[PDB]
Amino acid sequence: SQIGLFSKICRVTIKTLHYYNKIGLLVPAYINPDNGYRFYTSDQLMKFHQIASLRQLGFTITEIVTLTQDENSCHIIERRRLEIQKQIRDMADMLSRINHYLQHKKKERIMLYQAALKEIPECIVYSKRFIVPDFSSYIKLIPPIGQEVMKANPGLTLTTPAYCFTLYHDKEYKEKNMDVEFCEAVNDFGKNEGNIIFQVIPAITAVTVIHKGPYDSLRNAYIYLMQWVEDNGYLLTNSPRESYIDGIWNKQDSAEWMTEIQFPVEKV
Amino acid sequence: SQIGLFSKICRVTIKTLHYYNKIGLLVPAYINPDNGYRFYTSDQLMKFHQIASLRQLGFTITEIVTLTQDENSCHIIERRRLEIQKQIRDMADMLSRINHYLQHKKKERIMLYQAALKEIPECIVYSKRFIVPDFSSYIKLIPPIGQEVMKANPGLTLTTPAYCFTLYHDKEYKEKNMDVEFCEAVNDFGKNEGNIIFQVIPAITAVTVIHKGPYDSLRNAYIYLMQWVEDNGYLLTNSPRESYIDGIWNKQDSAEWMTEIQFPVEKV
Ligand code: 118
Ligand code: 118
């Protein structure tokens, strides 16, 4: 059976048979030496059937070489079983994500906020946890802390890139009784004089959305994020953070400012 | 903020930012013409955030380059949703097949048969449907059926490759007095003579198993295939075909016989 007839028997292209010969997966029975023409037999169709049966299960080519040459190799198929289970979980989450994205673009003509699930590493921060009467009053008392901590810790260099955020330790919603904890990441340990202390903040996977503009609309992102958090079945494992990209330090106009709200979540 | 500090903000590789810049997506703010350095600003971070959100959604890069600026293009999102649904369906299929594979390999030392789905086209066959008392009498009676057909039709040329097969239109296991229909696909129309007719057999999606051995033990294969259709949640849509590829006519050794069982099947 010449390669054309055989390629139509097994119903696959010629280049596929060329490739399977090139990698040594399916070798013709008899190659004519001067022309190089490949001729197969029935016992090449018998092997191509096994090859295609394994290849419909997603096995990579080298995995098929091993599956056909090494017997009692059930650990590689089980490994592939676990990987396929992981991709099914991931694809179902993707389904929920794309349903929510389509649900939004029909709900609003503009996508104001996209939600990204990113991993944030562990940090070394100086932290002050305290009650706040008003979030507007919360903004002013931070540069005093900036003076104070650099005073008490000489030569303490903050991490680059700068990570300056807020934990919201409140389990429900209110506007004037916010129990917050301001954390900012530095390089080394330090002195703990004052309400300012040092602590290690563990690495977390968190869904974050970046809101750009003034802070009075920031709650929007939270409602959105909360929707997201409930829609895709994620569970909020820790208190929500808010990391400051743009603000009074870089830029003077308060409408081009930008913060990023981060929800610590776990997949359940 | 050079590309290193920006790549450390997003926790992304320098090569990814390079690739994005090459493709036109996420062009940086300032490319210094003396040394070609790349400086990024936080607005580029805001753009990269939605880039990373879509890349976390499964969207290919050309789809992100078309989605990040032409904000009206929405049909491409239900289209991606349909692609993901197709993949989830096929992955669930694959998962059922891998679990069935694992149970069967843990069962027996030797994997005798290996099922594979393939799309068999429609084909113009000549057919003869009739009753047989046993399998051996049937095996002996096919060749005179072929001889009668080649005599009654002058100029009848078979199709290459030779798709010559039979159908068991019974639904339960009938060992004797079988209602069997032999058929073979030909090049073009002939004239109906006797009880042999011509017709066009429609294209199917068939789960196939190649039996190597004498014909009286093809039965095993069917049971296996049956388990495969009940286990992996497929459904037998039509009478099972059995195609003869290699056998007593081409090689007189009984142990080099090849028959390709084809269950017409549909997904549930
Ligand atoms: C110590 C404590 C706070 C700040 Sb900053 C800041 C943070 C990261 C990168 C640049 C600046 C600040 C504010 C105004 C003027 C100058 C610096 C800051 C304040 C509130 C909330 C978040 C960050 C700086 C040092
Ligand atoms: C019409 C009917 C049967 C056969 Sb064949 C056969 C040939 C090629 C591929 C598959 C089957 C046959 C028999 C003798 C000499 C040459 C060809 C055949 C034989 C036994 C059982 C079933 C079919 C051929 C034409």
Side-chain angles (χ1 to χ4, degrees), chain A residues 5 46 49 53 56-57 74 81 85 94 99 105 114 116 118 121 208, chain B residues 11 49-50 56-57 81 94-95 97 99 105 114-115 117-118 160 208:
Chain A
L5 183 63
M46 179 275 295
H49 196 268
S53 164
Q56 286 186 2
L57 272 66
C74 43
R81 200 260 287 268
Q85 290 262 296
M94 287 290 193
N99 282 332
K105 202 269 186 182
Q114 61 277 326
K118 59 186 52 161
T208 184
Chain B
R11 302 166 194 85
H49 187 259
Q50 73 181 359
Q56 284 296 112
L57 203 48
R81 176 175 169 271
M94 188 194 288
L95 182 61
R97 305 257 291 278
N99 292 336
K105 189 212 166 279
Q114 276 147 333
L117 187 147
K118 65 187 64 169
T160 177
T208 78

PDB file of all heavy atoms in Angstrom, chain A residues 5 46 49 53 56-57 74 81 85 94 99 105 114 116 118 121 208, chain B residues 11 49-50 56-57 81 94-95 97 99 105 114-115 117-118 160 208:
ATOM      1  N   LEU A   5      -2.591   5.625  -0.979  1.00  0.00           N
ATOM      2  CA  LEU A   5      -3.637   4.662  -0.672  1.00  0.00           C
ATOM      3  C   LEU A   5      -3.757   4.443   0.825  1.00  0.00           C
ATOM      4  O   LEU A   5      -4.865   4.382   1.364  1.00  0.00           O
ATOM      5  CB  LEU A   5      -3.339   3.344  -1.371  1.00  0.00           C
ATOM      6  CG  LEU A   5      -4.393   2.271  -1.187  1.00  0.00           C
ATOM      7  CD1 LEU A   5      -5.666   2.753  -1.801  1.00  0.00           C
ATOM      8  CD2 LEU A   5      -3.918   0.998  -1.837  1.00  0.00           C
ATOM      9  N   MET A  46      -2.809  -1.433  11.666  1.00  0.00           N
ATOM     10  CA  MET A  46      -3.056  -1.908  13.021  1.00  0.00           C
ATOM     11  C   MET A  46      -2.377  -1.034  14.067  1.00  0.00           C
ATOM     12  O   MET A  46      -2.926  -0.836  15.155  1.00  0.00           O
ATOM     13  CB  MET A  46      -2.591  -3.359  13.152  1.00  0.00           C
ATOM     14  CG  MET A  46      -2.752  -4.004  14.533  1.00  0.00           C
ATOM     15  SD  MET A  46      -1.394  -3.676  15.682  1.00  0.00           S
ATOM     16  CE  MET A  46      -0.040  -4.501  14.859  1.00  0.00           C
ATOM     17  N   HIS A  49      -4.128   2.628  14.072  1.00  0.00           N
ATOM     18  CA  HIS A  49      -5.381   2.658  14.815  1.00  0.00           C
ATOM     19  C   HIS A  49      -5.134   2.879  16.298  1.00  0.00           C
ATOM     20  O   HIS A  49      -5.814   3.691  16.935  1.00  0.00           O
ATOM     21  CB  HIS A  49      -6.160   1.375  14.573  1.00  0.00           C
ATOM     22  CG  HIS A  49      -7.594   1.468  14.975  1.00  0.00           C
ATOM     23  ND1 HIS A  49      -8.041   1.102  16.224  1.00  0.00           N
ATOM     24  CD2 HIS A  49      -8.679   1.912  14.300  1.00  0.00           C
ATOM     25  CE1 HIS A  49      -9.344   1.301  16.296  1.00  0.00           C
ATOM     26  NE2 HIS A  49      -9.755   1.792  15.142  1.00  0.00           N
ATOM     27  N   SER A  53      -6.260   6.140  18.479  1.00  0.00           N
ATOM     28  CA  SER A  53      -7.056   5.929  19.680  1.00  0.00           C
ATOM     29  C   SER A  53      -6.437   6.611  20.889  1.00  0.00           C
ATOM     30  O   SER A  53      -7.147   7.204  21.706  1.00  0.00           O
ATOM     31  CB  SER A  53      -7.201   4.438  19.950  1.00  0.00           C
ATOM     32  OG  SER A  53      -7.640   4.219  21.276  1.00  0.00           O
ATOM     33  N   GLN A  56      -6.654  10.619  20.487  1.00  0.00           N
ATOM     34  CA  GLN A  56      -7.909  11.284  20.799  1.00  0.00           C
ATOM     35  C   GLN A  56      -8.077  11.535  22.288  1.00  0.00           C
ATOM     36  O   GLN A  56      -8.972  12.291  22.677  1.00  0.00           O
ATOM     37  CB  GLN A  56      -9.090  10.492  20.253  1.00  0.00           C
ATOM     38  CG  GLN A  56      -9.206  10.616  18.761  1.00  0.00           C
ATOM     39  CD  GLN A  56     -10.444   9.969  18.230  1.00  0.00           C
ATOM     40  OE1 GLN A  56     -11.258   9.454  18.988  1.00  0.00           O
ATOM     41  NE2 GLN A  56     -10.608  10.003  16.917  1.00  0.00           N
ATOM     42  N   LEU A  57      -7.237  10.928  23.118  1.00  0.00           N
ATOM     43  CA  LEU A  57      -7.207  11.199  24.546  1.00  0.00           C
ATOM     44  C   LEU A  57      -6.266  12.336  24.912  1.00  0.00           C
ATOM     45  O   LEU A  57      -6.014  12.556  26.100  1.00  0.00           O
ATOM     46  CB  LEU A  57      -6.817   9.940  25.317  1.00  0.00           C
ATOM     47  CG  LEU A  57      -7.913   8.968  25.736  1.00  0.00           C
ATOM     48  CD1 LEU A  57      -8.579   8.314  24.547  1.00  0.00           C
ATOM     49  CD2 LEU A  57      -7.304   7.912  26.633  1.00  0.00           C
ATOM     50  N   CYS A  74       1.005   2.535  33.730  1.00  0.00           N
ATOM     51  CA  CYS A  74      -0.202   3.191  34.193  1.00  0.00           C
ATOM     52  C   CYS A  74       0.033   4.458  34.991  1.00  0.00           C
ATOM     53  O   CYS A  74      -0.888   5.269  35.083  1.00  0.00           O
ATOM     54  CB  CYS A  74      -1.028   2.166  34.960  1.00  0.00           C
ATOM     55  SG  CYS A  74      -0.021   1.128  36.065  1.00  0.00           S
ATOM     56  N   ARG A  81      -4.458  11.691  33.618  1.00  0.00           N
ATOM     57  CA  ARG A  81      -5.806  11.762  34.158  1.00  0.00           C
ATOM     58  C   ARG A  81      -5.911  12.922  35.136  1.00  0.00           C
ATOM     59  O   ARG A  81      -6.878  13.690  35.119  1.00  0.00           O
ATOM     60  CB  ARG A  81      -6.157  10.421  34.802  1.00  0.00           C
ATOM     61  CG  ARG A  81      -7.627  10.150  34.988  1.00  0.00           C
ATOM     62  CD  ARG A  81      -8.047  10.437  36.410  1.00  0.00           C
ATOM     63  NE  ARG A  81      -7.538   9.389  37.289  1.00  0.00           N
ATOM     64  CZ  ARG A  81      -8.222   8.297  37.609  1.00  0.00           C
ATOM     65  NH1 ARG A  81      -9.442   8.123  37.123  1.00  0.00           N
ATOM     66  NH2 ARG A  81      -7.691   7.379  38.407  1.00  0.00           N
ATOM     67  N   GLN A  85      -8.136  16.297  34.705  1.00  0.00           N
ATOM     68  CA  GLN A  85      -9.061  16.763  35.729  1.00  0.00           C
ATOM     69  C   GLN A  85      -8.774  18.214  36.082  1.00  0.00           C
ATOM     70  O   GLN A  85      -9.701  19.017  36.269  1.00  0.00           O
ATOM     71  CB  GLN A  85      -8.881  15.928  36.997  1.00  0.00           C
ATOM     72  CG  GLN A  85      -9.317  14.493  37.007  1.00  0.00           C
ATOM     73  CD  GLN A  85     -10.686  14.336  37.620  1.00  0.00           C
ATOM     74  OE1 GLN A  85     -10.868  14.613  38.805  1.00  0.00           O
ATOM     75  NE2 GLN A  85     -11.649  13.875  36.840  1.00  0.00           N
ATOM     76  N   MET A  94     -13.303  28.942  33.624  1.00  0.00           N
ATOM     77  CA  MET A  94     -13.294  29.807  32.445  1.00  0.00           C
ATOM     78  C   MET A  94     -14.706  29.999  31.908  1.00  0.00           C
ATOM     79  O   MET A  94     -15.049  31.079  31.420  1.00  0.00           O
ATOM     80  CB  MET A  94     -12.438  29.183  31.347  1.00  0.00           C
ATOM     81  CG  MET A  94     -10.948  29.219  31.546  1.00  0.00           C
ATOM     82  SD  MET A  94     -10.185  30.833  31.432  1.00  0.00           S
ATOM     83  CE  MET A  94      -8.471  30.332  31.331  1.00  0.00           C
ATOM     84  N   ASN A  99     -19.102  33.557  30.958  1.00  0.00           N
ATOM     85  CA  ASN A  99     -20.512  33.855  31.128  1.00  0.00           C
ATOM     86  C   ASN A  99     -20.695  35.177  31.849  1.00  0.00           C
ATOM     87  O   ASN A  99     -21.541  35.983  31.456  1.00  0.00           O
ATOM     88  CB  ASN A  99     -21.204  32.701  31.841  1.00  0.00           C
ATOM     89  CG  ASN A  99     -21.469  31.538  30.904  1.00  0.00           C
ATOM     90  OD1 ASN A  99     -21.622  31.724  29.696  1.00  0.00           O
ATOM     91  ND2 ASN A  99     -21.526  30.335  31.450  1.00  0.00           N
ATOM     92  N   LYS A 105     -21.196  42.618  29.388  1.00  0.00           N
ATOM     93  CA  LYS A 105     -21.196  43.480  28.208  1.00  0.00           C
ATOM     94  C   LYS A 105     -22.607  43.664  27.673  1.00  0.00           C
ATOM     95  O   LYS A 105     -22.915  44.684  27.051  1.00  0.00           O
ATOM     96  CB  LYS A 105     -20.304  42.902  27.110  1.00  0.00           C
ATOM     97  CG  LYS A 105     -19.846  43.951  26.111  1.00  0.00           C
ATOM     98  CD  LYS A 105     -20.769  44.089  24.929  1.00  0.00           C
ATOM     99  CE  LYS A 105     -20.209  45.029  23.909  1.00  0.00           C
ATOM    100  NZ  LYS A 105     -21.181  45.156  22.799  1.00  0.00           N
ATOM    101  N   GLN A 114     -12.454  45.292  34.279  1.00  0.00           N
ATOM    102  CA  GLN A 114     -12.132  43.882  34.144  1.00  0.00           C
ATOM    103  C   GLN A 114     -11.491  43.354  35.425  1.00  0.00           C
ATOM    104  O   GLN A 114     -10.785  44.078  36.129  1.00  0.00           O
ATOM    105  CB  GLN A 114     -11.220  43.668  32.942  1.00  0.00           C
ATOM    106  CG  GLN A 114      -9.910  44.398  33.063  1.00  0.00           C
ATOM    107  CD  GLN A 114     -10.011  45.854  32.637  1.00  0.00           C
ATOM    108  OE1 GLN A 114     -10.769  46.198  31.727  1.00  0.00           O
ATOM    109  NE2 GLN A 114      -9.262  46.721  33.309  1.00  0.00           N
ATOM    110  N   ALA A 116      -9.021  40.580  37.315  1.00  0.00           N
ATOM    111  CA  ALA A 116      -7.909  39.672  37.051  1.00  0.00           C
ATOM    112  C   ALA A 116      -7.505  38.923  38.312  1.00  0.00           C
ATOM    113  O   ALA A 116      -7.327  39.537  39.363  1.00  0.00           O
ATOM    114  CB  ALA A 116      -6.709  40.424  36.489  1.00  0.00           C
ATOM    115  N   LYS A 118      -4.758  37.338  40.176  1.00  0.00           N
ATOM    116  CA  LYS A 118      -3.304  37.289  40.168  1.00  0.00           C
ATOM    117  C   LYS A 118      -2.776  36.863  41.534  1.00  0.00           C
ATOM    118  O   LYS A 118      -3.461  36.971  42.550  1.00  0.00           O
ATOM    119  CB  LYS A 118      -2.717  38.632  39.745  1.00  0.00           C
ATOM    120  CG  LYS A 118      -3.099  39.802  40.608  1.00  0.00           C
ATOM    121  CD  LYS A 118      -2.568  41.077  39.989  1.00  0.00           C
ATOM    122  CE  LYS A 118      -2.999  41.157  38.521  1.00  0.00           C
ATOM    123  NZ  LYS A 118      -2.927  42.528  37.952  1.00  0.00           N
ATOM    124  N   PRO A 121       2.932  37.918  46.140  1.00  0.00           N
ATOM    125  CA  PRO A 121       3.889  37.266  47.040  1.00  0.00           C
ATOM    126  C   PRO A 121       3.879  37.870  48.440  1.00  0.00           C
ATOM    127  O   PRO A 121       3.296  38.923  48.698  1.00  0.00           O
ATOM    128  CB  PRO A 121       5.244  37.499  46.357  1.00  0.00           C
ATOM    129  CG  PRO A 121       4.935  38.091  45.014  1.00  0.00           C
ATOM    130  CD  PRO A 121       3.616  38.761  45.152  1.00  0.00           C
ATOM    131  N   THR A 208      -7.985  41.023  41.691  1.00  0.00           N
ATOM    132  CA  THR A 208      -7.812  42.452  41.813  1.00  0.00           C
ATOM    133  C   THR A 208      -8.447  43.153  40.627  1.00  0.00           C
ATOM    134  O   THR A 208      -8.561  42.594  39.522  1.00  0.00           O
ATOM    135  CB  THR A 208      -6.363  42.866  41.925  1.00  0.00           C
ATOM    136  OG1 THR A 208      -6.314  44.281  42.132  1.00  0.00           O
ATOM    137  CG2 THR A 208      -5.651  42.565  40.655  1.00  0.00           C
TER     138      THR A 208
ATOM    139  N   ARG B  11       4.630  41.464  37.715  1.00  0.00           N
ATOM    140  CA  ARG B  11       5.166  40.111  37.921  1.00  0.00           C
ATOM    141  C   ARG B  11       5.150  39.315  36.623  1.00  0.00           C
ATOM    142  O   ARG B  11       4.726  38.159  36.574  1.00  0.00           O
ATOM    143  CB  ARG B  11       4.396  39.385  39.020  1.00  0.00           C
ATOM    144  CG  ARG B  11       4.433  40.112  40.335  1.00  0.00           C
ATOM    145  CD  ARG B  11       3.411  39.554  41.286  1.00  0.00           C
ATOM    146  NE  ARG B  11       3.203  40.431  42.434  1.00  0.00           N
ATOM    147  CZ  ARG B  11       2.366  41.464  42.455  1.00  0.00           C
ATOM    148  NH1 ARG B  11       1.638  41.768  41.386  1.00  0.00           N
ATOM    149  NH2 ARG B  11       2.249  42.188  43.560  1.00  0.00           N
ATOM    150  N   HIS B  49      -3.444  45.543  32.395  1.00  0.00           N
ATOM    151  CA  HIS B  49      -4.337  44.813  33.282  1.00  0.00           C
ATOM    152  C   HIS B  49      -5.436  44.112  32.494  1.00  0.00           C
ATOM    153  O   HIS B  49      -5.736  42.942  32.744  1.00  0.00           O
ATOM    154  CB  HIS B  49      -4.934  45.713  34.343  1.00  0.00           C
ATOM    155  CG  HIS B  49      -5.721  44.958  35.361  1.00  0.00           C
ATOM    156  ND1 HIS B  49      -7.097  44.895  35.350  1.00  0.00           N
ATOM    157  CD2 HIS B  49      -5.315  44.198  36.404  1.00  0.00           C
ATOM    158  CE1 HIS B  49      -7.505  44.145  36.358  1.00  0.00           C
ATOM    159  NE2 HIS B  49      -6.444  43.713  37.014  1.00  0.00           N
ATOM    160  N   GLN B  50      -6.062  44.808  31.542  1.00  0.00           N
ATOM    161  CA  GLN B  50      -7.101  44.120  30.789  1.00  0.00           C
ATOM    162  C   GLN B  50      -6.497  43.125  29.817  1.00  0.00           C
ATOM    163  O   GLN B  50      -7.116  42.089  29.533  1.00  0.00           O
ATOM    164  CB  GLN B  50      -8.003  45.091  30.029  1.00  0.00           C
ATOM    165  CG  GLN B  50      -7.400  45.754  28.818  1.00  0.00           C
ATOM    166  CD  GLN B  50      -8.374  46.698  28.158  1.00  0.00           C
ATOM    167  OE1 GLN B  50      -9.511  46.837  28.606  1.00  0.00           O
ATOM    168  NE2 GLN B  50      -7.940  47.358  27.093  1.00  0.00           N
ATOM    169  N   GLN B  56      -5.841  35.675  30.887  1.00  0.00           N
ATOM    170  CA  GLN B  56      -6.308  34.774  31.924  1.00  0.00           C
ATOM    171  C   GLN B  56      -7.670  34.209  31.583  1.00  0.00           C
ATOM    172  O   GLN B  56      -8.188  33.377  32.331  1.00  0.00           O
ATOM    173  CB  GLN B  56      -6.384  35.485  33.277  1.00  0.00           C
ATOM    174  CG  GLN B  56      -5.054  35.702  33.966  1.00  0.00           C
ATOM    175  CD  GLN B  56      -4.378  34.403  34.340  1.00  0.00           C
ATOM    176  OE1 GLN B  56      -3.346  34.043  33.777  1.00  0.00           O
ATOM    177  NE2 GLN B  56      -4.964  33.686  35.289  1.00  0.00           N
ATOM    178  N   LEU B  57      -8.271  34.674  30.489  1.00  0.00           N
ATOM    179  CA  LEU B  57      -9.573  34.176  30.079  1.00  0.00           C
ATOM    180  C   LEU B  57      -9.483  33.107  28.996  1.00  0.00           C
ATOM    181  O   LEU B  57     -10.486  32.444  28.716  1.00  0.00           O
ATOM    182  CB  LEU B  57     -10.422  35.357  29.607  1.00  0.00           C
ATOM    183  CG  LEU B  57     -11.928  35.245  29.614  1.00  0.00           C
ATOM    184  CD1 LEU B  57     -12.330  34.709  30.945  1.00  0.00           C
ATOM    185  CD2 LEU B  57     -12.457  36.641  29.495  1.00  0.00           C
ATOM    186  N   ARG B  81     -17.142  31.710  23.707  1.00  0.00           N
ATOM    187  CA  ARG B  81     -17.918  30.924  24.652  1.00  0.00           C
ATOM    188  C   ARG B  81     -18.307  29.589  24.031  1.00  0.00           C
ATOM    189  O   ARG B  81     -18.225  28.543  24.685  1.00  0.00           O
ATOM    190  CB  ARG B  81     -19.152  31.706  25.084  1.00  0.00           C
ATOM    191  CG  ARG B  81     -20.078  30.938  25.986  1.00  0.00           C
ATOM    192  CD  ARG B  81     -21.211  31.812  26.463  1.00  0.00           C
ATOM    193  NE  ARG B  81     -22.233  31.010  27.117  1.00  0.00           N
ATOM    194  CZ  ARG B  81     -23.254  30.455  26.478  1.00  0.00           C
ATOM    195  NH1 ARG B  81     -23.387  30.628  25.171  1.00  0.00           N
ATOM    196  NH2 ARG B  81     -24.139  29.730  27.146  1.00  0.00           N
ATOM    197  N   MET B  94     -13.178  12.870  26.861  1.00  0.00           N
ATOM    198  CA  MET B  94     -11.822  12.373  27.061  1.00  0.00           C
ATOM    199  C   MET B  94     -11.631  11.842  28.478  1.00  0.00           C
ATOM    200  O   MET B  94     -10.916  10.857  28.687  1.00  0.00           O
ATOM    201  CB  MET B  94     -10.843  13.492  26.720  1.00  0.00           C
ATOM    202  CG  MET B  94      -9.396  13.107  26.677  1.00  0.00           C
ATOM    203  SD  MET B  94      -8.372  14.588  26.660  1.00  0.00           S
ATOM    204  CE  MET B  94      -8.688  15.179  24.998  1.00  0.00           C
ATOM    205  N   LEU B  95     -12.232  12.504  29.463  1.00  0.00           N
ATOM    206  CA  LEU B  95     -12.099  12.067  30.847  1.00  0.00           C
ATOM    207  C   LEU B  95     -12.785  10.725  31.056  1.00  0.00           C
ATOM    208  O   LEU B  95     -12.264   9.848  31.760  1.00  0.00           O
ATOM    209  CB  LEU B  95     -12.677  13.118  31.786  1.00  0.00           C
ATOM    210  CG  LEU B  95     -12.572  12.839  33.284  1.00  0.00           C
ATOM    211  CD1 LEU B  95     -11.130  12.705  33.758  1.00  0.00           C
ATOM    212  CD2 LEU B  95     -13.289  13.965  34.006  1.00  0.00           C
ATOM    213  N   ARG B  97     -13.186   8.507  28.755  1.00  0.00           N
ATOM    214  CA  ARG B  97     -12.352   7.529  28.065  1.00  0.00           C
ATOM    215  C   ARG B  97     -11.109   7.175  28.867  1.00  0.00           C
ATOM    216  O   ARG B  97     -10.702   6.010  28.894  1.00  0.00           O
ATOM    217  CB  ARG B  97     -11.943   8.055  26.694  1.00  0.00           C
ATOM    218  CG  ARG B  97     -13.086   8.474  25.827  1.00  0.00           C
ATOM    219  CD  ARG B  97     -13.338   7.420  24.800  1.00  0.00           C
ATOM    220  NE  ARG B  97     -12.276   7.329  23.804  1.00  0.00           N
ATOM    221  CZ  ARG B  97     -12.177   8.121  22.742  1.00  0.00           C
ATOM    222  NH1 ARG B  97     -13.072   9.076  22.536  1.00  0.00           N
ATOM    223  NH2 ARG B  97     -11.181   7.958  21.889  1.00  0.00           N
ATOM    224  N   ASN B  99     -10.773   7.303  32.198  1.00  0.00           N
ATOM    225  CA  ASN B  99     -11.181   6.466  33.327  1.00  0.00           C
ATOM    226  C   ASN B  99     -11.508   5.043  32.887  1.00  0.00           C
ATOM    227  O   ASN B  99     -11.142   4.075  33.571  1.00  0.00           O
ATOM    228  CB  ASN B  99     -12.364   7.089  34.060  1.00  0.00           C
ATOM    229  CG  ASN B  99     -11.993   8.367  34.770  1.00  0.00           C
ATOM    230  OD1 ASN B  99     -10.830   8.586  35.107  1.00  0.00           O
ATOM    231  ND2 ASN B  99     -12.983   9.211  35.029  1.00  0.00           N
ATOM    232  N   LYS B 105      -7.162  -1.278  31.947  1.00  0.00           N
ATOM    233  CA  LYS B 105      -5.762  -1.670  32.060  1.00  0.00           C
ATOM    234  C   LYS B 105      -5.436  -2.250  33.424  1.00  0.00           C
ATOM    235  O   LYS B 105      -4.579  -3.136  33.530  1.00  0.00           O
ATOM    236  CB  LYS B 105      -4.874  -0.456  31.790  1.00  0.00           C
ATOM    237  CG  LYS B 105      -3.403  -0.762  31.669  1.00  0.00           C
ATOM    238  CD  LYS B 105      -2.549   0.375  32.157  1.00  0.00           C
ATOM    239  CE  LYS B 105      -1.121  -0.089  32.350  1.00  0.00           C
ATOM    240  NZ  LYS B 105      -0.964  -0.803  33.645  1.00  0.00           N
ATOM    241  N   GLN B 114      -8.530  -1.546  21.273  1.00  0.00           N
ATOM    242  CA  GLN B 114      -8.449  -0.116  21.553  1.00  0.00           C
ATOM    243  C   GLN B 114      -9.426   0.601  20.636  1.00  0.00           C
ATOM    244  O   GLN B 114      -9.224   0.642  19.420  1.00  0.00           O
ATOM    245  CB  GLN B 114      -7.025   0.394  21.380  1.00  0.00           C
ATOM    246  CG  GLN B 114      -6.187   0.170  22.617  1.00  0.00           C
ATOM    247  CD  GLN B 114      -4.738  -0.097  22.306  1.00  0.00           C
ATOM    248  OE1 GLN B 114      -4.405  -0.605  21.236  1.00  0.00           O
ATOM    249  NE2 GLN B 114      -3.860   0.258  23.236  1.00  0.00           N
ATOM    250  N   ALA B 115     -10.470   1.171  21.217  1.00  0.00           N
ATOM    251  CA  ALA B 115     -11.512   1.824  20.444  1.00  0.00           C
ATOM    252  C   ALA B 115     -11.078   3.206  19.981  1.00  0.00           C
ATOM    253  O   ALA B 115     -10.294   3.889  20.642  1.00  0.00           O
ATOM    254  CB  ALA B 115     -12.794   1.935  21.265  1.00  0.00           C
ATOM    255  N   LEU B 117     -12.832   6.684  17.692  1.00  0.00           N
ATOM    256  CA  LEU B 117     -13.926   7.274  16.939  1.00  0.00           C
ATOM    257  C   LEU B 117     -13.411   7.810  15.613  1.00  0.00           C
ATOM    258  O   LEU B 117     -12.358   8.449  15.559  1.00  0.00           O
ATOM    259  CB  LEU B 117     -14.584   8.391  17.751  1.00  0.00           C
ATOM    260  CG  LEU B 117     -15.868   9.057  17.249  1.00  0.00           C
ATOM    261  CD1 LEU B 117     -16.727   9.460  18.434  1.00  0.00           C
ATOM    262  CD2 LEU B 117     -15.587  10.280  16.380  1.00  0.00           C
ATOM    263  N   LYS B 118     -14.155   7.550  14.540  1.00  0.00           N
ATOM    264  CA  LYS B 118     -13.790   8.089  13.239  1.00  0.00           C
ATOM    265  C   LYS B 118     -15.043   8.351  12.422  1.00  0.00           C
ATOM    266  O   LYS B 118     -16.058   7.675  12.580  1.00  0.00           O
ATOM    267  CB  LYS B 118     -12.849   7.134  12.502  1.00  0.00           C
ATOM    268  CG  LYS B 118     -13.476   5.812  12.138  1.00  0.00           C
ATOM    269  CD  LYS B 118     -12.441   4.861  11.572  1.00  0.00           C
ATOM    270  CE  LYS B 118     -11.398   4.533  12.620  1.00  0.00           C
ATOM    271  NZ  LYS B 118     -10.505   3.423  12.213  1.00  0.00           N
ATOM    272  N   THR B 160     -11.508   2.149  -4.394  1.00  0.00           N
ATOM    273  CA  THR B 160     -10.217   2.121  -3.723  1.00  0.00           C
ATOM    274  C   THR B 160     -10.146   3.217  -2.663  1.00  0.00           C
ATOM    275  O   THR B 160     -10.291   4.405  -2.988  1.00  0.00           O
ATOM    276  CB  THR B 160      -9.075   2.235  -4.738  1.00  0.00           C
ATOM    277  OG1 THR B 160      -7.818   2.273  -4.061  1.00  0.00           O
ATOM    278  CG2 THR B 160      -9.235   3.422  -5.690  1.00  0.00           C
ATOM    279  N   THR B 208     -14.702   2.368  16.419  1.00  0.00           N
ATOM    280  CA  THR B 208     -14.169   1.219  15.717  1.00  0.00           C
ATOM    281  C   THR B 208     -13.158   0.502  16.593  1.00  0.00           C
ATOM    282  O   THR B 208     -12.502   1.109  17.448  1.00  0.00           O
ATOM    283  CB  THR B 208     -13.527   1.618  14.398  1.00  0.00           C
ATOM    284  OG1 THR B 208     -12.233   2.175  14.644  1.00  0.00           O
ATOM    285  CG2 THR B 208     -14.397   2.620  13.678  1.00  0.00           C
TER     286      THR B 208
END
